[PDB]
């Protein structure tokens, strides 16, 4: 009923528009009221809040122009920098496609600025890469030396400056004055200064504050923060020891086990990431990350029924996506459940909020069709995948395979050239182009294509026989 009370109760119920809407009134009515002031600050900063732990988009500049790893060429198995590409689709030379895209995924790194620019913008991150990773209150007007004295105001004000305005320097000024006001005895200000540092670039100066905050009071937050810091310095085996220390503190934490599994998958030894995702499951059993990862791994290691179970679980827990339903369709078809197969693809096509998701669903429908026979339906589905996403290399490759099945060799050659131009990291377009060339002749093009195939999937077999035959023809 009353303004302040109704606004605060709107805040408790996570409205975040009404709260501010009543405080703006209450502030116009009285120029001297700090309760509604910091309440509107909280509402504004929480309409946009996103926890700093899972925001790790380095981009392009950090990837090359910033060197922090001590060892330049460390032993294979101690640095971050399964099914073969003949089964599991790939994204780079290696790095098979993963389940559960998270905005911290790097999934390989480019070598030079030119390569990173001249590639698709979303081939190394979940979002397109970036070079660098009225108003309620004007930051240049308030004296942070006076709000630092009042911690009740200072905490919400720092959260506002950091998560709403993204002013790391003024946030760090406020946090430094606040920490010196608390005589360096509250772990929260230490963690916040460490976050300011970590997104300023100073990792060691942030690891110092995170360690000093762990000494004050163990919290899952500081453990994950140190994990981020250590992963940024390219030190997996330090992060794993720190995670096992945290699990010694918190015996069954799910985020810590999930971080261990993420590190094991970045190092690409799935035989332990599955164990740790299974521990996460034994703890949560609704975890979307572990369920999706184990489901994908179960699908690609020729066990599609277990993957169908793992994805029906996510269906049972109210998850309603385009990805989930296309996955259910692939699993139902390949696990030989032909009644619930195509309705899942229909729900997928219904739920797709993009033009690339629609293209992927049409690609998978073409796979279903070509598994059924009737190559014309798959032809149409691949052409629609192209019509939806012009830069869809798998559709080009499959449509060229079907074209050469029909007989049109030049169409297949052009389409395979387009596919291999869009995705060089794939091996199928190169191998097919080399095969058709060798079939007609042109052993130079066959060599230039089979060598790129071997560069893409270096443990292939038919590529090796092709290269042997070619090098034999050259003498």
């Amino acid at each position: 009923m009353e303004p302040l009370l109704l606004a605060w109760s709107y805040f408790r119920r996570r409205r975040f528009q009404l709260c501010a809407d009543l405080c703006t009134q209450m502030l116009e009515k009285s120029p001297c009221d700090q309760a509604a002031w910091i309440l509107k600050a909280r509402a504004l900063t929480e309409m946009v809040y996103v926890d700093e732990i899972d925001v790790d988009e380095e981009g392009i500049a950090e990837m090359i122009l910033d060197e922090n790893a001590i060892a330049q060429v460390p032993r294979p198995g101690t640095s971050l920098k399964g099914p073969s590409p003949a089964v599991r689709p790939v994204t780079q030379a290696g790095r098979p496609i993963t389940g559960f895209l998270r905005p911290s995924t790097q999934s390989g790194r480019p070598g030079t600025i030119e390569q990173a620019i001249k590639t698709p913008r979303t081939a190394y991150t979940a979002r397109p890469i970036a070079s660098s990773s009225g108003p309620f209150i004007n930051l240049s007007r308030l004296n942070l030396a006076k709000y630092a004295q009042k911690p009740k105001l200072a905490k919400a004000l720092f959260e506002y400056i950091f998560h709403h305005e993204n002013d790391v320097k003024t946030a760090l000024d406020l946090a430094a004055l606040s920490t010196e006001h608390s005589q360096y005895k509250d772990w929260w200000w230490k963690v916040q200064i460490g976050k300011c540092y970590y997104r300023l670039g100073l990792y060691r100066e942030a690891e110092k504050q995170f360690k000093s905050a762990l000494k004050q009071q163990e919290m899952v937050d500081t453990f994950l923060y140190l994990a981020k810091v250590y992963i940024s310095l390219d030190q997996p085996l330090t992060a794993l020891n720190l995670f096992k220390q945290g699990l010694d503190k918190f015996p069954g934490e799910v985020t810590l086990l999930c971080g261990i599994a993420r590190i094991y998958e970045e190092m690409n030894n799935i035989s332990s990431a599955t164990e740790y995702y299974k521990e996460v499951l034994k703890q949560d059993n609704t975890h979307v990350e572990a369920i999706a990862c184990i489901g994908s791994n179960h699908f690609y290691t020729d066990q599609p029924e277990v993957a169908l179970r793992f994805y029906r679980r996510l269906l049972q827990m109210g998850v309603y996506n385009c990805q989930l339903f296309n996955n259910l369709g692939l699993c139902c078809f390949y696990a030989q459940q032909y009644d619930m197969t195509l309705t899942s693809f229909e729900r997928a096509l219904s739920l797709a909020e993009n033009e690339e998701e629609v293209a992927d669903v049409w690609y998978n429908l073409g796979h279903v069709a070509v598994g059924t026979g009737d190559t014309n339906l798959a032809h149409q589905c691949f052409r629609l995948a192209l019509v939806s996403n012009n830069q869809h290399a798998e559709a080009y490759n499959n449509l060229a395979v079907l074209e050469m099945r029909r007989g049109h060799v030049e169409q297949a050659k052009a389409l395979l050239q387009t596919a291999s131009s869009l995705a060089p990291h794939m091996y199928e377009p190169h191998f097919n182009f080399a095969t058709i060339s060798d079939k007609i002749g042109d052993l130079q093009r066959s060599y230039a294509a089979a060598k790129k195939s071997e560069a893409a999937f270096p443990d292939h077999v038919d590529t090796q026989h092709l290269i042997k035959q070619l090098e034999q023809h050259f003498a």
């Binding site: 500049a61 620019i117 001249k118 660098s132 320097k169 300023l200 670039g201 100073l202």
Partner: protein, 116 residues
């Protein structure tokens, strides 16, 4: 005061270094796409940021030298206070003196170096 000034300058220089990295990448892209005007613009921006950063570097270097001098002065003070006493009465002072700096009890600190 020297500590706080160093922290402020370090944050500022880190921000400018991030700007310079983005600019380097941004500048490189213009060169690749052969847009010479924006390339020259990026390099002008880089020149200005470098001059600002070198000014800040001089300031921070002088401040860091003064701070190191102050730290060595504090430690020489501890050592000259302890040095004035022979045997065990020396060691005590040193310990106490350090335990009087981690707590910023400057008056009690001086009382340790005055009587022991």
């Amino acid at each position: 005061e020297y500590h706080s000034v160093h922290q402020k300058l370090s944050a500022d220089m880190a921000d400018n270094s991030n700007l310079i990295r983005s600019l380097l990448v941004q500048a490189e892209d213009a060169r690749l796409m052969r847009d010479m005007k924006t390339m020259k613009n990026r390099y002008k921006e880089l020149y200005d940021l470098n001059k600002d950063l070198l000014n800040g570097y001089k300031i921070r270097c002088n401040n860091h030298t003064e701070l190191l001098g102050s730290l060595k002065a504090v430690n020489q003070a501890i050592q000259r206070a302890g040095h004035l006493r022979v045997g065990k009465p020396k060691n005590q002072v040193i310990t106490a003196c350090r335990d009087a700096i981690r707590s910023n009890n400057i008056n009690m600190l001086f009382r340790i170096m005055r009587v022991g």
